[PDB]
Structures are given as structure tokens and as C-alpha cells.
Design an enzyme around this catalytic site. Sequence first.
Site, PDB file in Angstrom:
ATOM      1  N   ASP A   1      52.435  -3.661 -65.985  1.00 16.83           N
ATOM      2  CA  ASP A   1      53.100  -5.004 -65.929  1.00 16.83           C
ATOM      3  C   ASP A   1      54.649  -4.964 -65.745  1.00 16.83           C
ATOM      4  O   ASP A   1      55.352  -5.178 -66.756  1.00 16.83           O
ATOM      5  CB  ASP A   1      52.533  -6.173 -66.619  1.00 16.83           C
ATOM      6  CG  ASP A   1      52.728  -7.561 -66.182  1.00 16.83           C
ATOM      7  OD1 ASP A   1      53.750  -7.803 -65.653  1.00 16.83           O
ATOM      8  OD2 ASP A   1      51.863  -8.593 -66.662  1.00 16.83           O
TER       9      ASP A   1
ATOM     10  N   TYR B   1      48.293 -23.441 -67.936  1.00 17.81           N
ATOM     11  CA  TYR B   1      49.619 -22.720 -67.496  1.00 17.81           C
ATOM     12  C   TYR B   1      50.632 -23.665 -68.112  1.00 17.81           C
ATOM     13  O   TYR B   1      51.250 -23.230 -69.040  1.00 17.81           O
ATOM     14  CB  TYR B   1      49.610 -22.894 -65.773  1.00 17.81           C
ATOM     15  CG  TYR B   1      50.650 -22.117 -65.349  1.00 17.81           C
ATOM     16  CD1 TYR B   1      50.596 -20.529 -65.550  1.00 17.81           C
ATOM     17  CD2 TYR B   1      51.835 -22.503 -64.838  1.00 17.81           C
ATOM     18  CE1 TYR B   1      51.653 -19.875 -65.231  1.00 17.81           C
ATOM     19  CE2 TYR B   1      52.853 -21.778 -64.295  1.00 17.81           C
ATOM     20  CZ  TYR B   1      52.754 -19.940 -64.638  1.00 17.81           C
ATOM     21  OH  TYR B   1      53.732 -19.332 -64.284  1.00 17.81           O
TER      22      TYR B   1
ATOM     23  N   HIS C   1      50.684  -7.524 -63.138  1.00 22.36           N
ATOM     24  CA  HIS C   1      50.817  -8.697 -63.672  1.00 22.36           C
ATOM     25  C   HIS C   1      49.458  -9.541 -63.352  1.00 22.36           C
ATOM     26  O   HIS C   1      49.481 -10.557 -64.107  1.00 22.36           O
ATOM     27  CB  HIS C   1      52.076  -9.508 -63.493  1.00 22.36           C
ATOM     28  CG  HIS C   1      52.118 -10.679 -64.397  1.00 22.36           C
ATOM     29  ND1 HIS C   1      52.159 -10.685 -65.703  1.00 22.36           N
ATOM     30  CD2 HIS C   1      52.229 -12.091 -63.653  1.00 22.36           C
ATOM     31  CE1 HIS C   1      52.377 -11.938 -66.168  1.00 22.36           C
ATOM     32  NE2 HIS C   1      52.223 -12.901 -64.840  1.00 22.36           N
TER      33      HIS C   1
ATOM     34  N   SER D   1      50.090 -15.511 -68.134  1.00 18.21           N
ATOM     35  CA  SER D   1      51.546 -15.586 -67.909  1.00 18.21           C
ATOM     36  C   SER D   1      51.895 -16.597 -68.720  1.00 18.21           C
ATOM     37  O   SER D   1      51.861 -16.564 -69.886  1.00 18.21           O
ATOM     38  CB  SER D   1      51.825 -15.562 -66.558  1.00 18.21           C
ATOM     39  OG  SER D   1      53.148 -15.633 -66.282  1.00 18.21           O
ATOM     40  N   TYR D   2      52.331 -17.554 -68.329  1.00 19.03           N
ATOM     41  CA  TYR D   2      53.016 -18.776 -68.936  1.00 19.03           C
ATOM     42  C   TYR D   2      52.084 -19.365 -69.740  1.00 19.03           C
ATOM     43  O   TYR D   2      52.082 -19.694 -70.856  1.00 19.03           O
ATOM     44  CB  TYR D   2      53.628 -19.773 -68.068  1.00 19.03           C
ATOM     45  CG  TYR D   2      54.695 -20.958 -68.679  1.00 19.03           C
ATOM     46  CD1 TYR D   2      55.888 -20.615 -68.895  1.00 19.03           C
ATOM     47  CD2 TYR D   2      54.147 -22.047 -69.430  1.00 19.03           C
ATOM     48  CE1 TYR D   2      56.735 -21.690 -69.654  1.00 19.03           C
ATOM     49  CE2 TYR D   2      54.814 -22.792 -70.259  1.00 19.03           C
ATOM     50  CZ  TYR D   2      56.003 -22.857 -70.410  1.00 19.03           C
ATOM     51  OH  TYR D   2      57.023 -23.375 -71.229  1.00 19.03           O
TER      52      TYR D   2
END
Lengths: 730, 730
Positions: B672, B511, B704, B594-595
Amino acid sequence: RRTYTLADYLKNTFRVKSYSLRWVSDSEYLYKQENNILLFNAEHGNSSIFLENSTFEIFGDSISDYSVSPDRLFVLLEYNYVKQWRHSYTASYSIYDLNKRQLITEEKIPNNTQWITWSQEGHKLAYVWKNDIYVKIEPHLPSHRITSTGKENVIFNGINDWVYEEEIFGAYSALWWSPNGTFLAYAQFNDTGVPLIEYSFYSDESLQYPKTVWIPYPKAGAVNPTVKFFIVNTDSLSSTTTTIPMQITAPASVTTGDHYLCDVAWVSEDRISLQWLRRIQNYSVMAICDYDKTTLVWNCPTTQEHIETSATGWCGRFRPAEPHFTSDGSSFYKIVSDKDGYKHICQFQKDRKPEQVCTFITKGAWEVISIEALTSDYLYYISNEYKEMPGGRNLYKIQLTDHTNKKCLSCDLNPERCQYYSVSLSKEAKYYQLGCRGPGLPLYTLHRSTDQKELRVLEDNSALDKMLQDVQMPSKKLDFIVLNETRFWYQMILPPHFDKSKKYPLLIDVYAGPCSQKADAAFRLNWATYLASTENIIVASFDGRGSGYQGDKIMHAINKRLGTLEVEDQIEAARQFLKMGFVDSKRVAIWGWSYGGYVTSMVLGSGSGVFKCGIAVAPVSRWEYYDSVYTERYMGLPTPEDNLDHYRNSTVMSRAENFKQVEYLLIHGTADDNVHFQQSAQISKALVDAGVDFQAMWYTDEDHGIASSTAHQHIYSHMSHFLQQCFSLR
Amino acid sequence: RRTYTLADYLKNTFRVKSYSLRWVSDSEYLYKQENNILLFNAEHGNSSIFLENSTFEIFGDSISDYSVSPDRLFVLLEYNYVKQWRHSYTASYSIYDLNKRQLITEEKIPNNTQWITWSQEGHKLAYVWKNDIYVKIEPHLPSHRITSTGKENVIFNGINDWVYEEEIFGAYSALWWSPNGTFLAYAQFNDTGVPLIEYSFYSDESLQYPKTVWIPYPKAGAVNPTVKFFIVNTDSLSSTTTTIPMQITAPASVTTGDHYLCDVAWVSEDRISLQWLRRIQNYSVMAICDYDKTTLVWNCPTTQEHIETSATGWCGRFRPAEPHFTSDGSSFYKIVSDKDGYKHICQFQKDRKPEQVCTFITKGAWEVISIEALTSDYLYYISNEYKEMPGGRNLYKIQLTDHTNKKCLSCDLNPERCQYYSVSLSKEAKYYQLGCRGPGLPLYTLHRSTDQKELRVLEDNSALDKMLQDVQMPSKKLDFIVLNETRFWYQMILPPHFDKSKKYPLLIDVYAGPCSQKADAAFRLNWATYLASTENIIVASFDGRGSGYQGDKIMHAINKRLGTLEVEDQIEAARQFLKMGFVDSKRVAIWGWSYGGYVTSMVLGSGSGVFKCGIAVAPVSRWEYYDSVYTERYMGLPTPEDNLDHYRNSTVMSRAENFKQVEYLLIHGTADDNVHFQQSAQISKALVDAGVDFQAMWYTDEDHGIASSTAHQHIYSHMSHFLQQCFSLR
Ligand SMILES: *[C@@H]1O[C@H](CO)[C@@H](O)[C@H](O)[C@H]1NC(C)=O
Ligand SMILES: *[C@@H]1O[C@H](CO)[C@@H](O)[C@H](O)[C@H]1NC(C)=O
Ligand SMILES: *[C@@H]1O[C@H](CO)[C@@H](O)[C@H](O)[C@H]1NC(C)=O
Ligand SMILES: *[C@@H]1O[C@H](CO)[C@@H](O)[C@H](O)[C@H]1NC(C)=O
Ligand SMILES: *[C@@H]1O[C@H](CO)[C@@H](O)[C@H](O)[C@H]1NC(C)=O
Ligand SMILES: *[C@@H]1O[C@H](CO)[C@@H](O)[C@H](O)[C@H]1NC(C)=O
Ligand SMILES: *[C@H]1O[C@H](CO)[C@@H](O)[C@H](O)[C@H]1NC(C)=O
Ligand SMILES: *[C@H]1O[C@H](CO)[C@@H](O)[C@H](O)[C@H]1NC(C)=O
Ligand SMILES: *[C@H]1O[C@H](CO)[C@@H](O)[C@H](O)[C@H]1NC(C)=O
Ligand SMILES: *[C@H]1O[C@H](CO)[C@@H](O)[C@H](O)[C@H]1NC(C)=O
């Protein structure tokens, strides 16, 4: 001892030449050479420069194409080509005055034209811009606006809307100059009530917010666009600010409900032929319309109205065939199915006759592919009669005065190398170029019509031949299997030193859409070539029920029930190939594109156990998602009052379960305006809900053809690797 | 000798229990048991039935949730829940009269409410419907419309627009009852100039034409929504048709350009605290506003305005921390970074003081995570001070009158099993439930505040414990590496009988977003558990620069340059893990969401040669695609006048080349709304243009989080298989 590699295919290492000429008269033609248009004299190889290496570079390197006015006095230079759908696209144009020797710069042509074309005779032009039609009697003179109702995604004047382009005319144009250029006919489409579909477009990575492309697209049973037909008098434009086009209205037996404009064919300057088709395509009408000099109107008397019908399925192969009128326009020849369901040439009279409108000029268990030319004494056509090979193409000719004087003109030439011919006759058939696409390397030769004497060889791929010497090329077998008392042709791409005693992995190449033909005698250098030459895989195609040019019995077998027999027959074929011995039952695959991806998917999901893996590219997954014209033609309307049950019974997602026994690869283009991404999105969802693992791949901003250079290479490499994994090779 | 299988995880075979109570007073609480709300007496386990098994089934099985009015006279029954974004969602509601023993059926509440909430005290309600606010002084009485400017995707009253929900408040609500329910404060958002983003929604396969979802979403540097703050007097509704809300205007030092409403905190009935933040988040202002009884207006004098600033990066962890006022509202405690960059608790006075507004009550190289309760004499908080473990959580308390009387309340309890605590104090802190999420199975116990005597154990996963006996569970190591003189914690999920002498494949779990923390002392039963227990793979996470709760030096290291140090440090960490010996350098992977997917991608594309493969799920590929509030907070504006260079330098697509040395798997949800599909679409395109093969997978209509049941199972199975292929296992 080198083989045909994936790179050879992707980088197109072995170029296959051809000879695409443009007949300018009954005895001369144009040919592009080293970027020089040359005028040739059929008879004596005698040539000459028509357009210089120069000229073309004035527009840098964006000169997309060129069009020479019929009177050879001017040339249209097309540049700044930008694709849109299969045949649509906008470009810029410049007229080049051959005589004055320079580019006409006065009354230029709009810098975003959607379509343009010379008249049939002089140097008249008609082009569509912003959905409106414009005419220019002379390249130097100012254009005359013919319509002003044009509006993006709503009113189309002289160009087809999405569905008409893709499913009816197969072209963007909707303009037709009469001979002698007096009149200009055109269709007008209204997309008003047609629903919209939308897909995102990401474009360059610099675009912060992706675009949204909207297209009026009618899916099965949706509101279709509407049509109107007009003919405007061109000779009056100089004396008015506006001309009033006269409209022709479709025939009554078509007007009651939804219908389509089928085809347009100018007979003479005062007679035009229009074909119409009802939404349920088993009824078609050809009206012959005459121009009334007195009341300045066109009349299409029911007496000159011809009806084409079908109780087995639909009219024509993909639509009624085009009529070919005689000089005096008193009669015309047209391809229609005979009593036995075989597409043959028959004669008609201007006025219809009570249940005897036709007199067949051809009989037999084979079909006429197309009428190539009609002389005052001869009728040239193409059929697959020879050797009873439906997958073969040969040029024939019949004497009108004596229907017995029927002679094949390509049969003997090179029975070994050539079995698939293409033709191109001169303006009045004094000569004819032959295009041998046949089994061996393609061979182009022009002949003198009179005695068929080959004047010379235009192109024999001797260069390609020399290069293929040092390469282990695969072979192509074209034979037939027999099921339930019927011949069904197939073809196999056998790896180089093919040994009937060993076992090879099998890859079924599919399409199998209505009236399709994957098994033929044409030569090709594609992916299957690499698959056989370097991976030692056997690539086979099978034309089963619902397929090709072998009569309506076979083609209409699929009627009202797609996703049925054509799929089964594809499995049966595989069974047979196994019985042949040289196939490793443990490594059988199948892949298809568009309709092919649909069947590929339907097969993999049949739980027949016969296939290990498969690849479906941009597949149709359920018929309600596909466009109306195509879908309905074979499926009727998705209503409980018609064929709703079969629409819902032929879903790919409904077979999600059986996919647990298969390695599946689903590929789709992000910008597919034809078979919308939705179709695959629906498939993936169905499999995910069934808990079936599979592989997917989307191609950002790619068309239904995923044909952009990088994407094209990427997708084939990816599929290659998928097969290597599936077949335990790489 | 059974292991934790993929199925154990996916089918959630081993349930981990907890004890989520709801304090009703300073001495009683509510607990759901067998679908019965029970009222408990903290002190004596003494219970009692509050709400029957019944009641809840009157609404079949769609009873999504329940809310008891603070005066325990009524209960909100939530049903027909329909998600929308992370915290948004609409539902239906029914008020149940506990006393009258039946469902109130008169003045019902709209059947599509977006948000609803009891007042802080009585039985008043405030709900948002169709973007407008409504109040009901009594469940039986008719609602009073407070606003009427509400309009879908334009004007939001009492609820946040997309970005405010996701990036500021982390909740859908934008309503705040004052204590004693006289006033009702709310924010109003205007999305007028905010650009729209759209994604297709395929829904059931029966939907012929896919839908299009439009959302006003501001990407980096785009026009942001605007805010207004209002407070309406509730006590007057009975005597007017309409009330006129009074507006509070943000402070001058914020009004000049774009800005945001940070946080809302009622101090007392006539005092409210509002925090504001400039678009460039290194400046924040907390205004304390007082209610003028005479002129019926709220005043926010600059004298009571407090300023929070940052020269290293941005204000707060994700935003300024919330103030905690004393009863008389004369002072308040709030978490802010001290001279050394460590987030600590310090005291403030209503009126600001020239460069001495704060007096810290906490010092040290560790941080206060959050203030849990403020008594007249004690301040309860949570920190990671104990054992100098930033990844640990412990409950502390300081005596206000004597800042030395500081005592840890969870440290001793179970030093072996518990190191990560959660807390829940009663209304006035007479008791406090402890939630040991610690290393071992979670343990819940309630204590009496006075002497910390554990009254009893609420839940000890003894049942889960018994089941895990017959299963080879992996172990979790939480230690630290030291780079350039600094501690950097990491954690490893070691397979069962872990042998330091053998070699295991390594999977880096990532992450690494700003202020994130993947290495901690919490117990979990996730995918990594299966990966270690059954595949013998070591799953490791590393909190490098820009990470967690270890002071601003570490967290602000990433400022204005994402895709930098946090990525490198993730590679360095892998290097170190190799030096540790038990890692097979030939089988090292990395995956993120995600990140995390972003870094995973940035790592794989660094060409460091350290990783073999990786999986990026819904990754951000270039910061201009992500939303403004989040992106800008760390990156500033993407303008040449600010940080445009770093925006364009940290692209994933710009590293497409280095992907030729990696097996890459890209996964993304079709719907998303957070990290738009565009991000991955842009990645795939970049790789295709570079001629790099890779694997992709799209999930039709998934969020998402790709958390729908079937998709959730499907994606993890797919990734499992990808790793097995990559690591040569399956
Ligand atoms: C035509 O141009 C080509 C290159 O574009 C050049 O090789 C050639 O010499 C030119 N003229 C002729 C007659 O080939
Ligand atoms: C055409 O198809 C419909 C069913 O779709 C049928 O009822 C009708 O009789 C068919 N025949 C002709 C000649 O149109
Ligand atoms: C032959 O008959 C069988 C009946 O069992 C049928 O399944 C099959 O479709 C028929 N035709 C072909 C080409 O297989
Ligand atoms: C037990 O708790 C109830 C409420 O749960 C309370 O009314 C009562 O006083 C307590 N003690 C006894 C002996 O009932
Ligand atoms: C905030 O950031 C800007 C540039 O990003 C900088 O010039 C300014 O001095 C910073 N500090 C404060 C307190 O605004
Ligand atoms: C340590 O210093 C070197 C440069 O001297 C740098 O590469 C590295 O990123 C620095 N910090 C860490 C945590 O590695
Ligand atoms: C052969 O054709 C050329 C032009 O292609 C023509 O000009 C010429 O007259 C013809 N024959 C001879 C002998 O010139
Ligand atoms: C085509 O149909 C639409 C809607 O029925 C109508 O607005 C339009 O005017 C029609 N025809 C023409 C020539 O525009
Ligand atoms: C009430 O019904 C539940 C089922 O929802 C049942 O399990 C239970 O026995 C009943 N209540 C209590 C307190 O046991
Ligand atoms: C919010 O901003 C928009 C756009 O400037 C404006 O039209 C609207 O009236 C503003 N305020 C309200 C309460 O609508």
C-alpha cells in the site's frame, strides 16, 4: 485441585531454580546471591563476599552483567545492553578495581562496545568498537588500536558478520587470547559482495517515517563473505605506534573456492589449531600451526593437517567438533563419526597418519555428546549411552592410561529424578557441579572429583516442589516407536489424571531440523504444560529421520532433500499415536517454529488428512530464501549443476492446494532478520492465489523469537485461542 | 427461490450493463460493440463501422485502450498496460492511420510512455517518457523533445508526482493543449526535499531477494514538492533544435510560502486560467493570463486575479471548482459557496470587482454538483435539488438571458426507477445521453436537446432484469433521521422478505471522510447485496457531520478535528437504528476501508458498547502518517503553533484499551503506497502492548485497493467468515 494455567506460564508463577556458578580456580567459585557475588570454597560450604550488593547499583538498574578478570583483581561491569541478532549486542562498560576499591575512571572503554573479553590469565582486555579491535594491557592504561579497516556492514574485525554469528560460531566474538596472553588471534570478515536484505522498523508511534534496516545476508547460493586470520603480538604494543599482525592463510585444499573458518583452538602459547570447511561442507581441514621464533611467522605444515570427510552428508553435527589437546600438545581427542556412523571420541597425533589418523576410545550404538575436560590421566565426557536413551544425558570418565577404567558418574545418583545431566568441572577437575535437568525437578549438587562424594546439594527445587503440590501437574512419557526395524523416540505430555481408556485431542510439537531432538528427559514448565494441565490436550514430539544423536544413518537420511522424510515420519508418528488408542482422531493438530513451522506447513499441505489444524510460526517456506551456511550444508547449491531440483520441489507454496482441508494459522515477526517475513509473505500469497482461507498474524517490530514481553504473551494467548476454536473447547 | 450468493458477487454472475459513448461531434458518437468501434448518428439510430473487430487483435489481446484523434484521421492503440498508483501507469502505443488503412511504423512512440494525448483539435500528440515531454505535429513525423530535466523521483515534466496525482488532480497527466493547438502548457514538479517512504515487494516466489520500492511521499507537515508552470509554443518546433518554454509564475499572494497548483483551464488560444492554493488551504487565487503577441510573454495582471476564501474550513469540496468561460472569455461561471454555505453557480467577470466578484445564479438548501456544459444561451448542470434528496442526482438547465427559465430535464422521466443521473452532452449540446444510475436497474437513453424528446433507449438492463427474476434480491431504503434539528440521510440494504417485526443483525458500512456520501439513490450489486440476500443482515450507511453535499455547515463541522464528530455521529446513527425496532442490539457490526477503516477503528475503540465487532481495511491510524495535501486540508500543520494537539488526540492506538470489548479484524496490503502498512503496524503494536487479542490479515504485494483478482476474492471471503463467526451464523 488447581491446574497449570496459561497465566502460570505467561506470568512465570512457578519459578524453576538453578545453580549457575563460575569456577575461579581449581577449588573456589563465584555465585550470585541477592545481587552479591560470593566466593565459595568447594569442599567446605565455606563462603565469603566477593562483590557487594552495592557497586552494582552505582549504575542504577541497568547492570546487565559482570565479568571477573581471571586474576580476580578487577571486574567488568556491563550496562546499557542493546540486543542485535541472536548473540550480538552493544553495551557500556566500567572496570572496578577490587583492590583499590573503586571504579577505574581514567582510560575508559568506549560507550558502545560490540564485544569485550579478559585475557585467559592476567587482566588484559581486548574489545571491538566500530568494527575494530583494541587492546589494553592494564585497566588503567590507554587502549592500543589493533586494526583500522573496520567499517559497518563491510569489514568486521574480531566479531562475526550476520551469517558467521548465526550459523558458524553461534556467538558474536571472533577474538581468541592465547594462553599466557602473548598473542591475540582474530578473524576478519569482508561482506563486500554479499547481497543485502531489508526490513522496515516502525519503532514508537511517534516516528513519522519508518526506518529501514539493511543487513548483508547471503541466501542459498549467493556470494558469501570472505575470511582472513590474524595473530598479533601483544607484548610489543608499548614500544610502537602500530603493530603488524601476522596472517595465517587457510590450507590449500580449501583455498580453491568459497570456504569458511570453522573453529579456533589455542593449543599452547606457540601452537594454535584452526579448522576450515569448504562451501560444500563434506570436506574439512584442521591445521595445527606453530610459531617460528626466528622468522616471527606462524607455519601450518601440511604434515600437521588433518582431514575430516563425509560421504553420507556433512561434517559434524552443525560443524566439525572441537579438538581437545593434551598439556604438551602432542595429541588431541576429538569427536568424529566411526566406521558405523556413530559420533565417538578418538585420539589423534599432531602429525597426521596415512588413513589411521584416529584411534577410537569409544564404541557403540550411542554417541558422545561432548568432551567436558581433559586431565593428564582422565577424560570427562557426556553421552547418551545409559539405558540406551538417546534423549538422556550422563557424565562419564575414562582413564587415559587404561581405556577400560570407564565409569559413569551420574547414572546411580537419582535414577528416578535424574536422567539428563549437565556438568561443570573446576579448573583442573578437582570438583564437579552436576546439573540434573532430568525428568523430575532439576537438582544441582557439587562433588569431589577423587571419589565422587557428593559434598552437598547446591539446589533442590524444594520450594518449587511445595508450590506444585497444590497443582494438578501433567506427566511426561518418553518412549519409542519402531518403524522399519528402527527405534524412534517420542515424548508425550499427558494431562493430569490421564486415563488410557478415554480419548484426548493431540497436538504434535515440531522442529525436526537436522540433528534436532525434541524427545528427551529434561524437565520443563512451558506452554505444553498448560495445554495438558488445563485443556486436557496431549502434546507429543517425535524425533524421526534426520534427527538427533543416534548415528549418521538416521541424521544423514535427510541429506540433499529437506522437506521429505522428516515430514513424512512426523505424519507416520501421528498414525502410530492414534493406534495407541487414547487419541481422538477427530482432533489432531501440529505446530512449529522456524524449521518447525516449515514442517508444520509441509505436513498440513501434504493432504494426508491426518491433521485438522496447525500453527506455523516464522516458517521457512522455500530454501532459496534461507541463509547459505545453513541451507547449503544440507541442500548443496541451488544450481542445475547440483541440487536445484530439490530446492524447487520442497516449497510450501507448491502445496497451497492441500490447505483447503485445514484450519491454518500463519504467524510472523515484522523484524525477523533470520527467517525473513518474505517467507511467510510468499506463503500467504500462494494460498490467496489458490483461494484457500487461513488465519494470519504479524507482530510489529518483533524478532525471529517474538520474545518481547507483551508480544510473547500475546502470541501464546492467540495460539491458545486458535486451538480452542479448532478443538471446539472455547 | 435462489439468493444473491457470495459467489454471485465474487464471480460477477449478474453483469450490470451501461452505455459509455464518445461524442465525436455535435451529432455523432463512438460506441464499442463486440470489439468494434462503431460510429453512431444521434437522431437516427443510423450506425456504421469505424474500427474493425480486426486491428485490435494485431496486438494479440493486450490492447488496453484506444484514443481517436479529434479529426478522426488516426487512432491511438494502447497496449502493455502496467499500473502504478491510482491513475499512473506505463504502456506502449501504435498510431493507426484510418485513411491509409494501416499502422504507422516510422517515427514510433517510445515503448514505455507514461502519458500521451491528442491535441484538442488536429492530430498533434504530446507524450511523457522518462519524465520528459515530447511533441509530434504529425503521427508520421519525428518527435520534438520539449524538456530534458526529467529525472525519476525528482523532476516531473507533464506528469504529477505521487501526491499531486492522488490529492490534487486525481490524474497522472500535467499537460494541457490550448485550443487550436498553438501552445502546450505543462507543470513541472520537483520532489527534491520530499522524504521517501519504502515498502518491500516480494514478487514471484522465484525472486530470491525482495525488491524495495522508494517513493517521495510527504506526510503531514513534511517538505512538499515544488511547482513551476510553462507554456511552450508548438508552431515553432520545425524551425529550431530547441524551443524555450515561457514560464508563468504563481501570484504574489501565494509565493510567500508553500503552495500548490490547483487547476488549469484554457479559456481561448491567448488566455489561460490557473488556480493556486496555499499550503493552508483556506486561501485560493484564480489568475487569468493573457498572451502578449508583442513581447511573447504571458501576463497575469492582479486585476484579473480572483480570490476564494473560507473562514469555516477549506476551499471547495476537495479543491476549488473549475471555471467555465463563455466563448469570448469575458465571463465565467463557477461553483462556490454562497452566503449560507451552499455550493452554487455564480457569474464572474474577467476583471475582479471589489467584494462583488460574484452574482449567484442559484439559491437554496441544496447544492450544484457540477457544471456539465455552457452554451451561448444555456447552462447545463447537475444538482440534488429535486425532492430535497442530497443523495439524488438530476440534470438541469438555465437560460443565460433569463435566469428564470430554469428546467429539470430528468425529474419526470422515471421517478420510480431513476433518481440518480449522469449526463453526457454532444460537442455543442445538440443531444445528451442520460445515465440513470437511479434506484432501479440503470437506464441509458439519449435525447435531442431542443425539446428533450427521447430519441431512443440506449440500454435498459432487461437482460439483467430477467436473470434477477429468479433471485431473491434485497431492497434499498434511503431515508433520513433528524438530530439536533437537522436532517441526516442514511440508507439500508434490507434483506429480501424484510419483516419489520423481526430482529436482524446490523452492519454499518463506513467511510465518512470529509465531503463523502455513502447514502444515495444509486443501484449496486456489491458485497452488501450478498450480506442481505443470503445472510439476512442489514447493511446501513449514514452520512453524518463533515459529510456530503448539504452545505458547509455540515461539511466544515469536522474542520481541524478529524476523528471527532464524524465518529460520534456514526454511533448515534446506530443508536437510532436500534430504536427503529428491527435490529438485534446483540449483533451490531461496523467495517470501513481507508478513511472508513479509520472511523471503524475509532468507533470500536470508543467503548460505547454499541458494537460487537468490526473490520478495518487499510485504515489510517494517526494523521501524521498520511500525506500532506489531504491531511493538512482538514487538519492544518501538526505543529504546536497550529494543530498538533488534535493530531495527537485523534490516534487509534490511544484507544487500544477499549478494544478488549470487541472482536476486531485488521486487514492491510503489503504494497500500500497510499495508506502505508505502518498505519496498521502501529495499531497492532498498540493492541499487543495493551494485551488485547484481535485478528489480522496482510495481503502480500497488494495495493491500497487489494483489488487483484485472487486477493479481492480472498479478502471478501475472509471478512464474510469473520462476520459469520461474530454473528454466530457459520
Ligand atoms: C543484599 O541486598 C538484598 C536486596 O537487594 C537484601 O535483602 C540483603 O539483606 C542484602 N545483603 C545480604 C547479605 O543479603
Ligand atoms: C561432496 O559433495 C559433492 C556433491 O555436492 C560430491 O560430488 C563430492 O564427491 C562429495 N564428497 C566429498 C568427500 O566431498
Ligand atoms: C519404511 O519403508 C517405507 C516404504 O514403503 C518408507 O515409506 C518409509 O519412509 C520407511 N521408513 C520409515 C521410518 O517409515
Ligand atoms: C446514415 O448515417 C450515415 C453515417 O452513419 C450517413 O452518411 C447517412 O447520410 C445517413 N443516412 C443514410 C440514408 O445513409
Ligand atoms: C486560514 O487559517 C489560518 C489558521 O489555520 C487562520 O489564522 C486564517 O485567518 C484563516 N483564514 C484565511 C482566509 O487565511
Ligand atoms: C447535538 O448536541 C449534543 C450536545 O448538546 C451533541 O452531543 C451532539 O453531537 C449534537 N449534534 C448531533 C448531530 O448529535
Ligand atoms: C574456608 O574458605 C574461606 C574463604 O572462602 C577461607 O578464607 C578460610 O580460610 C577457609 N577455612 C577456614 C576455617 O577459614
Ligand atoms: C575484502 O574484499 C573486498 C572486496 O573484494 C575488498 O574491498 C577488501 O579490501 C577485502 N579485504 C580487506 C582486508 O578489506
Ligand atoms: C467480429 O468478431 C467478433 C469477435 O470479436 C464477433 O463476435 C462478431 O460476430 C464480428 N463482428 C460483428 C459486427 O458481428
Ligand atoms: C527544484 O528544486 C531542487 C531542490 O532545491 C533543485 O535542485 C532543482 O534544481 C529545482 N528546479 C529544477 C528545475 O530542477
